[PDB]
Ligand binder design. Structure first.
Ligand SMILES: [Zn+2]
Ligand SMILES: [Zn+2]
Ligand SMILES: [Zn+2]
Lengths: 49, 146, 181, 82, 40, 602, 160, 39
DNA sequence: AAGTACTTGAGCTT
DNA sequence: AAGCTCAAGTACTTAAGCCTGGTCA
RNA sequence: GACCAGG
């Protein structure tokens, strides 16, 4: 429902949150690009470089 | 499109709420202020930033210079005249014989004497909120009027 | 205001000294000479302008002696140098010698016109200027940041005007060669 | 402080980009509040274009006080300004 | 709160200079059309 | 704003400063002692944090103290006493360095008295603003010798003030220099320059818990404790050295420790109903915590008085003391005791001073995505019908525009060019929405008449009679209504356009020219439209900021407006010498360019 | 005593818009208000006012609103009562509950039976049941003696 | 807030000058009291 | 991350 | 001895505006 | 108020 991976150990994953995204079926291309895509994590996102 | 002629307000400071679902108002400041105050439109600034959003009439004690210390008089007499506000901090207790004019009473029943320098100044509600929280931090600003 | 000639939003056409002398018939009506020459002082500061232009010192810049609000005689040095060296450099439009002039022109007349516009073009007092400089930095700070060895642009400006830090990244110096070397 | 006398006034006689604004504004508000129209109207309705019709004729009250940064002021009528 | 605590301890009274301060209490700003006063 | 309300006061300044122990009880209106918030009948508990006297709890409950409804009740403070009193959290560090400067046995300064009196003369002479005169007084080179040096500084200041008599910026530049030098001097010294003793050192925590070990044996040859001890020792420090501290701050009552903090009224701390949950708030909760810890202090102090028995007594009592110190630290500094504290909701820079004071949401100001139109003007701006019919502004009613306001109210608030709702001069606003055209006609007929049902109806202050009825009407073709788009980088980003009202569409319209100023591509970005209500504001706006009067961007001189893409290349196609027009096309084109009647003048 | 005093006060009047021609009539519109009504500063009820003049300081416009402001100095004659002042009135109404008098024809005096000692007795005439002479212990009839004197309590007291 | 004296004849003269200065109920009652005080 | 000013301890000179 | 400028080292707040949606405990 | 979105 939310995505807070709350576990006693992080299992070697940097950010503990955000693992899940709603699949907005708004238009078919968005459905696919939900299934295909990846994302490298907010930890690097916050850094400005 | 969202238009806000008149609508709901904020519990704390009586500024319009942050909506488009609650008819919320649009934000105007912290750069919009620089724009006008470059245009040289002090009246437009004082109008939008003060007049349209949060306007009030509040009383202050000129003697003590406090805004929390104003209390409107209760049970002066029968219908008579209107409730003429007074200042608690600059008023002394009712012990002793004094003339009927300057005295007034409290909702709990207390009478006092003093604290008559109460004028009617315009002041944005947010400053009232700041006075509240500030004096909660135990420090209060004493504003003068002349 | 750095002698100001105005706040920049109107001081532009001063340097267009050809433009006014070109037509000159509409500008005089714009400045409304009949109402302005009445209340304001003209002769004294215009007289002292020459005395300040005296190459020796002990004479202030005319702007300090006589503020440019009421004395219709004060302009910065370079402005008067510009009008003079224009009258002498490009004398083609201005006529001349003097009698042939006094039909439609006069060098002193047109110079008084430029004097008048300078007076007409001061900073209107009350202009909030600090915020004007604030916009003057903010806008170009937005404009260009992708370059086309010292860092150039907003990282640079960040050091000079924001942090004013000691030990900047590359503080360099440039020395001119001399004939003996 | 002081209230500068008429004999010596340092301020600039030009009806500034600002005094024009505030003068015409407060005058239009005045005339909006059922005030004396000191000039024959042309049938004009707007409570401000009347103010401009007046200031063009230089028949307006409301002298303005220019505060020098010291604390003194000079009091200029609107007819007196340029 | 740091500037607040120091200016509160010392209790240093402005008149009030900037237009941000003139504004927080709602009065017309110093600059601009507010620089002068108009009288009848 | 209203145009009638006169308020006379012209605030000249505000003055900050501490708040003492007598006035906190002067402004007290009740005492909060019982932690329980609400009872079974759900009514406001008497004396509780929601007491009716503090602030009128809604559902139409009149406040007890002032006995008038919530719409006009301004709220009243409350006090919550504490005989612990814990030291004020915000001043903890400055209090800490002052304690370091204390000499407990000496009760004078670790610094030499002559040096602190030099410091005293510095400020004494700074008070009247004499800078070099302050650096002069050090021009002396020499306890008895020390007392002579002090008297030399005294005579220097005496002649200086004598010559002087017969805030501003540079004052603070020196008065902060003296503060930094004050610290540099005071904290460096360990042993008493007066007493020659070594008063014990002190150790603190970021949690605002302070003390250190007693003296060493060698220095005797030569932790945590109560706040009343610290308070009394600081009282001695102050009253024995009243001069330099008075200059620094004569009053020293409660600067560092708070004997009664105030609960602000219920008006400021609401029980917001989001859905069903009813949480009181963070501040009510934490005040509850400090109140419970206070009553626990009372009970544990009673247990102490009634009597390792002394050891258990002092241990548990110190535990209660440190807990109350910790929770009051939490209230005033949520940075300590790991909910927001007051300091964090202020300094958060997400909250006040930035999100409620400088820039605040505003009424009478709409917003839309914006399409272009070349046909209107460079002055004018389009206004869709919804903004026209819904954006209202007041109009006084005079002798010569009664006709227009009559027509306006005849139309009503549902059909342009109607007005919205009629204000009476007393201060009320009666609508035209629920009424019928018959009722609106009737109300509009008596629109120019003194209707106040006496010469002085409200009370014996009779100017209410003079002001006319203000009719709230919709914008129309001549009004000047601002525009802006965020980010507003440079001043031509906000301007004032004359309104022109269009039929039908649901998005404003502007001209190409202004575009390059607002820096929009009109791909579907949106611009705030505002409408200044009063006449002073719209007047100064229409004159100073009318679009054409912002023709030169002020970074440089070059023009920022202009005609653009189609117009410019078609200009290169019209100016070109290869183009010839006959009579018909020339007349038609010239006329299309001019468009006289709507612009006028000819 | 000599309860009447003159007080030349300074007040700050709002010059309404339509009266921007002359302030004097604009002074009148509110100086006619306070008369016969209470002004709390001077601790008295306004009786009358003359000597209306504005100190020439180029009266100021409230700096967002069209009506101006000005100092006006005016001398009121407020009746300033103190504890122990003595007042006389002509008796109009009398009843065995209180005594009713008018001082200066304007100010009312209604003094209950408690402030009257039991020494004074009410006789009821056969013509009017409510109205009747409030005799003293001596036997003096007070109706012809319309001028009656007593002291201020705040309301009067005839008990010594 | 400045206070000065008012004697008996001063009251009569001040009421006279007042009825002469500004020109209904108040003036009626003032005429009544002036008639009662005089005579 | 960037960087700031802040504060404490260890080595050298009278 | 110990006074006193010198050194790295420990605590410590900011990082554009808006606006609109959604889900959430 | 917090995490994903979006101009
Ligand atoms: Zn007071
Ligand atoms: Zn209340
Ligand atoms: Zn000692």
């Amino acid at each position: 429902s939310t995505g807070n991976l709350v576990s006693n150990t992080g299992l070697d994953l940097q950010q503990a949150t955000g693992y899940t995204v709603v699949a907005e079926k708004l238009n078919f291309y968005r459905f696919l690009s939900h299934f295909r895509m990846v994302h490298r994590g907010a930890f690097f996102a916050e850094l400005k470089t | 499109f969202q238009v806000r002629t008149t609508g709901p307000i904020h519990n704390l400071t009586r500024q319009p709420v942050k909506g488009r679902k609650r008819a919320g108002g649009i934000r105007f400041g912290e750069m919009e202020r620089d724009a006008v105050i470059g245009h040289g439109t002090s009246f437009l600034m004082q109008d939008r930033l003060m007049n349209c959003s949060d306007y009030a009439q509040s009383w202050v004690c000129r003697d003590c210079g406090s805004i929390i210390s104003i209390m409107s008089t209760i049970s002066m007499n029968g219908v008579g005249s209107a409730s003429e506000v007074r200042c608690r901090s600059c008023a002394k207790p009712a012990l002793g014989l004094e003339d009927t004019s300057d005295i007034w009473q409290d909702g709990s029943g207390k009478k006092f004497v003093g604290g008559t320098n109460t004028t009617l100044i315009a002041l944005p509600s947010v400053f009232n909120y700041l006075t509240a929280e500030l004096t909660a931090m135990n420090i209060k600003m004493m504003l003068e009027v002349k | 205001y750095g002698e100001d000639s105005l706040d920049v939003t109107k001081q532009k056409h001063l340097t267009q000294f050809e433009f006014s002398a070109k037509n000159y018939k509409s500008l005089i009506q714009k400045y409304k000479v009949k109402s302005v020459l009445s209340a304001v002082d003209s002769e004294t500061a215009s007289s002292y302008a020459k005395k300040a232009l005296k190459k020796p010192y002990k004479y202030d810049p005319v702007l300090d002696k006589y503020p440019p609000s009421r004395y219709l005689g004060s302009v910065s040095e370079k402005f008067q140098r510009a009008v003079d060296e224009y009258t002498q450099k490009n004398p083609d439009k201005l006529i001349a010698e003097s009698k042939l002039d006094d039909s439609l022109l006069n060098e002193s007349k047109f110079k008084a016109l430029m004097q008048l516009r300078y007076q007409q073009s001061l900073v209107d007092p009350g202009e909030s200027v600090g915020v004007l400089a604030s916009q003057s930095i903010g806008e170009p700070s937005t404009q260009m940041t992708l370059n086309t060895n010292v860092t150039l642009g907003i990282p640079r400006l960040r050091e000079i005007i924001m942090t004013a830090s000691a030990n900047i990244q590359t503080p360099t110096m440039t020395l001119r060669l001399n004939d003996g070397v | 402080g002081k209230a500068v006398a008429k004999e010596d006034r340092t301020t600039t006689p030009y009806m500034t980009k600002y005094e024009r604004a505030r003068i015409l504004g407060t005058r239009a508000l005045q005339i909006s509040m059922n005030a004396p129209v000191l000039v024959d109207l042309e049938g004009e309705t707007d409570p401000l274009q009347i103010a401009m019709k007046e200031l063009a004729q230089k028949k307006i009250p409301l002298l303005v006080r220019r505060y020098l940064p010291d604390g003194s002021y000079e009091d200029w009528s609107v007819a007196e300004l340029i | 709160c740091h500037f607040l605590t120091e200016a509160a301890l010392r209790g240093d009274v402005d008149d009030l200079s900037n237009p941000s301060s003139r504004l927080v209490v709602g009065r017309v700003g110093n600059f601009g059309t507010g620089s002068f006063d108009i009288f009848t | 704003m209203n145009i009638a309300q006169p308020v006379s006061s012209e605030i000249k300044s505000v003055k900050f400063g501490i708040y003492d122990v007598d006035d906190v009880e002067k402004i007290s209106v009740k005492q909060i002692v019982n932690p329980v918030l609400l009872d079974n009948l759900n009514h406001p508990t008497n004396g509780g944090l929601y007491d009716l006297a503090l602030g009128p709890y809604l559902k139409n409950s009149v406040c007890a103290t002032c006995h008038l409804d919530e719409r006009y009740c301004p709220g009243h403070f409350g006090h919550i006493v504490l005989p612990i009193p814990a030291y004020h959290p915000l001043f903890f560090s400055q209090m800490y360095n002052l304690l370091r400067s204390t000499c407990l046995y000496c009760h004078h300064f670790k610094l030499s008295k002559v040096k602190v009196h030099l410091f005293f003369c510095r400020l004494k002479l700074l008070d009247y603003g004499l800078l070099n005169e302050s650096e002069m007084v050090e021009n002396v080179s020499l306890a008895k010798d020390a007392a002579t040096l002090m008297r030399i500084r005294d005579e220097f200041v005496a002649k200086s003030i004598a010559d002087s008599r017969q805030l501003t910026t540079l004052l603070l530049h020196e008065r902060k220099k003296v503060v930094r030098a004050f610290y540099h001097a005071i904290s460096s010294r360990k042993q008493c320059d007066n007493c020659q003793s070594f008063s014990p050192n002190f150790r603190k925590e970021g949690f605002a818990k302070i003390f250190e070990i007693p003296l060493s044996g060698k220095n005797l040859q030569f932790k945590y404790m109560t706040s009343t001890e610290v308070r009394n020792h600081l009282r001695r420090l102050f009253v024995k050295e009243n001069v330099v501290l008075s200059r620094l701050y004569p009053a020293s009552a409660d600067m560092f420790f708070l004997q009664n903090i105030a609960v602000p009224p219920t008006r400021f701390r609401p029980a917001s109903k989001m859905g069903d949950e009813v949480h009181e708030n963070i501040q009510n909760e934490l005040l509850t915590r400090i109140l419970q810890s206070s009553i626990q202090i009372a009970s544990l102090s009673k247990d102490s008085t009634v009597e390792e028995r002394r050891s258990r007594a002092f241990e548990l009592l110190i535990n209660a003391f440190v807990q109350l110190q910790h929770d009051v630290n939490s209230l005033i500094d949520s940075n300590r005791n790991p909910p927001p504290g007051i300091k964090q909701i202020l300094e958060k820079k997400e909250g006040l001073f930035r999100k409620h004071m400088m820039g605040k949401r505003v009424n009478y100001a709409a917003r839309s995505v914006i399409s272009p139109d070349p046909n209107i003007e460079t002055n004018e701006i389009g206004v869709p019908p919804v903004f026209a019919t819904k954006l209202t502004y007041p109009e006084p009613v005079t002798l010569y525009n009664f006709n227009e306001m009559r027509n306006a109210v005849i139309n009503g608030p549902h059909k342009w060019p109607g007005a919205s709702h009629i204000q009476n001069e007393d201060g009320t606003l009666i609508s035209l929405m629920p009424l019928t055209i018959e009722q609106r006609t009737a109300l509009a007929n008596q629109l120019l008449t003194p209707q106040s049902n006496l010469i002085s109806s409200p009370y014996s202050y009779s100017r209410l009679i003079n002001t006319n009825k203000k009719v709230y009407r919709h914008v129309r073709n001549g009004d000047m209504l601002i525009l802006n788009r965020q980010p507003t980088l440079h001043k031509p980003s906000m301007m004032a356009h004359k309104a022109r009202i269009l039929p039908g569409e649901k998005t404003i319209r502007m001209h190409y020219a202004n575009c390059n100023s607002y820096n929009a591509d009109f791909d579907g970005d949106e611009m705030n439209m505002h409408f200044p209500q009063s006449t002073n504001a719209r007047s100064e706006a229409q004159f100073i900021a009318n679009t054409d009067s912002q023709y030169l961007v002020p970074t440089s001189g070059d023009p920022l407006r202009g005609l653009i893409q189609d117009h410019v290349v078609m200009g290169v196609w019209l100016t070109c010498k290869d183009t010839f027009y006959t009579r018909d096309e020339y007349q038609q084109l010239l006329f299309q360019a001019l468009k006289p009647d709507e612009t006028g003048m000819y | 005593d000599l309860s009447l005093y003159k007080q030349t006060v300074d007040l700050y009047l709002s010059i309404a818009p339509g009266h921007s021609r002359d302030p004097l009539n604009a002074i009148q519109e509110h100086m006619d208000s306070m008369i016969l009504s209470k002004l709390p500063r001077i601790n008295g009820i306004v009786l009358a006012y003359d000597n209306i003049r504005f100190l020439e300081k180029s009266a100021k416009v409230m700096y967002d609103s069209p009506f101006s402001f000005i100092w006006v100095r005016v001398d009121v004659l407020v009746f300033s009562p103190k504890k122990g002042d003595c007042l006389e009135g002509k008796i109009n109404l009398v009843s065995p509950s209180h005594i009713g008098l008018l001082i200066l024809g304007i100010f009312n005096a209604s003094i209950p039976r408690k402030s009257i000692p039991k020494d004074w007795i009410f006789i009821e005439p056969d013509t009017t049941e409510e109205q009747g002479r409030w005799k003293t212990n001596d036997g003096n009839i007070l109706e012809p003696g319309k001028d009656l004197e007593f002291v201020v309590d705040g309301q009067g007291t005839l008990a010594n | 807030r400045k206070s000065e004296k008012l004697d008996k004849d001063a009251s009569s003269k001040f009421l006279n000058r007042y009825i002469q200065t500004i020109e209904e109920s108040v003036l009626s009652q003032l005429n009544r009291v002036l008639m009662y005080l005089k005579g």
